[PDB]
Symmetry: C3
Subunit: 143 residues, 3 copies
């Protein structure tokens, strides 16, 4: 598929981007001394450190939003790649998603003013919606 | 694959169904004035609106359950499609999952009496379990 | 693909492992009488049972970590299988992930001392990182 290399590049970068969030989460837990498990807290200073922290919670929300958005893209974009779309159009779909999602993480973890984060979220969803509809038509017509 | 069009139809509809939940979540946050981020709250009335809401939490639980169930289906159903199953049997697997999952969201967000939601959850898991076992046998025998 | 049977075996076992966590979660909710929904609580003893429980929360954290790690593997490992890697090397990637993830669930739900869980988490991520980089190179060179 001509679109597949671009899809695999963008998707893998987004998986790596999620791994970055996972690592940041751990770093914040250690720095802020905020653990979700007693066994963790007892290792890292005592039971008083089994507690919630706003920065940790923020990291978790960013990671969750990633899972809600990037995982569908992994599916939709893979299938879309094999439908034989216009190369440039396909690239635009993938680039809008990649840029939008990277911007989303920056806006979330960087605590940027509203509605920057929400805009990046919505924007990145648009190529996903587009791919979804295209797959729907292709699937339905092949029934 | 003869089963693949039906799989792609059901899967894409389920992705769209998850997007519907994502949009509803936002609508409920705005209507109930309940935001998870201070930057959101300050935009939408003040810091007192950085708060939890039962309806918002319900939306999040529905979306989470979707991610726990639909994402495995996206994987299992794709692989299963290429194993050359009986067309009608394959359709039944996909339809049970689709109907069960749509019913699940309705039961969750509609606050239907127990155990309606839990039944739909369990029911929809059954075709997934079936596909999983079939893939296990095929994979193992090809080792 | 020569690596594909091993990938499909390990992946399906991990999906089943996640289903086990889902079932355990339900069992713990019923045993500890801790429900997230009023409709559930009213069915199972009264409104006082709409409450949080540490064991339930632990189950949810284990399931969430699974979704953060196993879902990327489902994607990365599938693509990696088609890149024509060394059979034994591919097997090692998949086995390290499988063993690491099973150990992770045991360490989490079994409340094993730190840093056993965190080590298993980190260890299992290493083959994923490896596959991600390999896909990046292949994708980039095919642009
Ligand atoms: O939740 C936990 O178990 C801990 C924890 C432990 C390890 C973490 O990143 C590993 C990781 C994540 C992603 C990777 C991607 C590629 C390669 C290695 C990777 N490695 C994060 C949190 C925290 C709580 C106690 C101490 C920190
Ligand atoms: O969490 C947030 O960032 C906000 C928010 C912002 C946007 C939302 O839906 C976008 C969306 C979702 C799914 C889509 C699927 C297809 C096409 C467009 C799509 N667009 C939801 C919540 C809420 C908090 C502050 C205001 C609401
Ligand atoms: O959250 C809920 O809806 C309930 C609930 C209900 C059912 C559950 O496992 C089903 C399941 C899960 C995974 C499967 C995998 C294969 C085959 C059947 C499978 N079946 C768990 C929790 C709990 C709250 C009220 C009572 C328990
Ligand atoms: C893909 C991973 C991107 C990580 C984005 C990290 C954004 C760091 O941005 C930082 O955010 C802080 C608030 O959290 C601010 O105090 C700093 O001014 C800002 O530099
Ligand atoms: C795929 C998306 C399906 C959305 C299902 C929304 C269900 C709306 O159902 C509504 O639920 C309310 C309680 O929340 C009740 O007050 C109403 O009687 C009922 O109509
Ligand atoms: C793939 C699913 C694996 C489930 C792992 C369950 C681990 C059970 O392990 C149990 O944990 C208890 C604490 O929770 C301890 O009291 C027990 O000593 C221990 O046997």
């Amino acid at each position: 598929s001509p679109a597949l290399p671009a899809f695999l590049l963008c998707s893998t970068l987004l998986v790596i981007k999620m791994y970055v969030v996972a690592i940041i989460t751990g770093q914040v837990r250690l720095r802020k001394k905020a653990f979700a498990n007693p066994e963790d807290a007892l290792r890292h200073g005592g039971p008083q450190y089994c507690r919630s922290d706003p920065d940790v919670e923020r990291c978790l929300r960013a990671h969750r939003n990633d899972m809600e958005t990037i995982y569908p893209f992994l599916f939709l974009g893979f299938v879309y790649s094999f439908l034989g779309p216009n190369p440039f159009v396909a690239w635009m779909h993938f680039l809008v998603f990649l840029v939008g999602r990277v911007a989303h993480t920056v806006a979330y973890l960087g605590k940027l003013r509203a509605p920057i984060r929400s805009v990046t979220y919505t924007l990145a969803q648009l190529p996903c919606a587009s791919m979804a509809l295209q797959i729907l038509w292709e699937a339905a017509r092949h029934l």
